[PDB]
Structure 1
Amino acid sequence: KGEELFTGVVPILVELDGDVNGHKFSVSGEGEGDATYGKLTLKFICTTGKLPVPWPTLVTTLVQCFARYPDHMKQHDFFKSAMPEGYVQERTIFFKDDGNYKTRAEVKFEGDTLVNRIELKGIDFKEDGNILGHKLEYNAISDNVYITADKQKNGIKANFKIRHNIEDGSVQLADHYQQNTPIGDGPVLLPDNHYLSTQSALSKDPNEKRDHMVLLEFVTAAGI
């Protein structure tokens, strides 16, 4: 029944509250998802002023229910099967030689709108590292999200790496560990091992003076 909620274009709202090394901030996002094409278009605004971390480091945190699952893999789509009640998504994100983010999000429908409500806590960051020093390029990210079942939680786990370009030509690795658990008590689809091929293009609205990010993203399941 959850998959039927994604056959057309679905409005998306994202709300994040964060604290990284004591720097508190909030982000609000709005956009649309079209799972038929695995396509997401969103604009995010820092509602508290200036974002204290680089926008690219928040992309993965800021709705994998919008993935395009090929017909032959649709029985492996945990994310839609949890809807409309939703799922809790938790991550730890280890920035190599720097701090970590720990995130908890609730992803669910509020009426016809798919909502991603997030809390983010970052600790152990270096004052003059790539994150708090804002040394990362405003650059796209792309990678594969490796998904496995977590029967014990009636959910899934995932792992993946993001390579963020640094301004000097080097790379800041962000190792992601993820867990998803359903909010409701209904049956869900527990998948065989597979991946999500994900690509995010980042841009700016030339007329927008608030600190913000425009995002175009494609997400497609594969590996079966």
Structure 2
Amino acid sequence: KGEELFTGVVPILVELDGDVNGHKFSVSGEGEGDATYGKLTLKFISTTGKLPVPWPTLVTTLVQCFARYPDHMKRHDFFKSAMPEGYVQERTIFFKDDGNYKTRAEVKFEGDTLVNRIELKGIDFKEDGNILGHKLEYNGGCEDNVYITADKQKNGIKANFKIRHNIEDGGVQLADHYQQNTPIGDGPVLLPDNHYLSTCSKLSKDPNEKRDHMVFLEFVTAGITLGMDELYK
């Protein structure tokens, strides 16, 4: 099925068109993903100058089909099973005491390259807030508690989760995510049982890149792993 499209290294193209409080911007990303290891290596650049929003706020928006699903859970990998036709990934991201992002992305194969084409709209942001004021630390993090549930009404997936962006000089800016995914193609997709995704992201800089950019390394993998110590008495 679509899982066989992720047996090896797959090129990735990411295109984001954003508009936050009237500030329009465009981000392009290139890299590769190895679903066998859940590994993502991507370099995003701003094609419109200095970003009006911090890079960490765009991480979740800027390809969960590269998540490492264990062998016994491949029967519930909706993201890969929707390929190559792909899926629509929609999100609303509420930044606590600030504005919100509304994103709609189409994730699909275009040849041998997996493309994530995104439209982002942000409203109600404070000019002196943590987002428009660039008060967030430039770093990623690990979020091991992301519950993916089946949305049989839309024949896809829904999920809600909180992202915690560290504020410079202390504090945490919360980003409440509400996500739904629906297949683009008519073909059968694997409606999953409820499970979890664990993601660790590392944000860095290319020393030879002059444009506003983000060097991005991410490991993402897919159930209740409690009680592992039971096997060892």
> Is this a same-fold pair by TM over 0.5?
yes
What is the CA distance between 1:149 and its match in structure 2?
Answer: 0.3
Q: Which residue of 1 aligns with 2:167?
A: 166
Give the structure 1 partner of residue 8 of structure 2. 8
Q: Measure, in 1, the Cα distance between the counterparts of 2:145 and 2:23.
A: 30
1:178 Cα deviation from its structure 2 partner: 0.1
State the alpha-carbon separation in 2 of the partners of residues 197 and 98 from structure 1. Answer: 26
Which residue of structure 2 lines up, in the alignment, with residue 114 of structure 1? 114
Residue 168 of structure 1, CA deviation: 2.0
Match of 1:150 in 2: 151
* Structure possessing the higher radius of gyration over alpha carbons: 2
SS in 2 for 1:37: coil
Unpaired segments of 5 or more residues in structure 2? 223-233
SS of the aligned residue for 1:128 comes to coil
Q: d(CA) in 1 for partners of 2:210 and 2:17?
A: 21
User: 2:33 & 2:2 partners in 1: Cα distance?
Assistant: 15
- For residues 175 and 154 of structure 2, the distance between their equivalents in structure 1, rounded to whole angstroms, comes to 25
Structure 1 CA distance for aligned equivalents of residues 153 and 164 of structure 2 = 31
* Deviations 1:10-53 (CA, angstroms, capped at 9, x unpaired): 00000000000000000000000000000000000000111100
| Alpha-carbon separation, structure 1, partners of 2:107 and 2:169 | 36
Instruction: After superposition, give the CA deviation of every residue in 1:100-139 in whole Å (9 maximum; x if it has no partner).
Output: 0000000000000000000000000001000000000001
Q: Secondary structure at the match of 2:3?
A: helix
1:135-182 per-position Cα deviation (integer Å, ceiling 9, x unaligned): 00001xxx4321000001110001111100001210000000000000
DSSP-derived class of the 2:68 partner: coil
Q: CA deviation at 1:98?
A: 0.3
CA deviations 1:54-87 (Å, max 9, x no partner) are 0000000000000000001111100000000000
Shift of 1:207: 1.0
**Residue matched to 1:180:** 181
- Please give the alpha-carbon distance, in whole angstroms, between the structure 1 residues aligned to 2:88 and 2:43: 23
Q: For 1:75, what is the secondary structure of its paired residue?
A: helix
**Does 2:196 match 1:213?**
no
- Counterpart-to-counterpart distance in 2, 1:100 and 1:146: 21
Identity of matched residues, %: 97
Aligned length: 218
Q: Distance in 2 between matches of 1:135 and 1:119?
A: 24
CA distance in 2, matches of 1:168, 1:193: 37
Q: Any idea what SS the aligned residue of 1:176 has?
A: strand
**Pairwise CA RMSD of aligned residues?**
0.6
- In the other structure, the counterpart of 2:228 is none
Distance 2:16 2:130 in 1: 22
Rounded to whole Å, the distance in 2 between the matches of 1:158 and 1:82 is 17
CA distance in 1: counterparts of 2:55 and 2:67, whole angstroms: 22
Cα deviation, residue 93, structure 1: 0.2
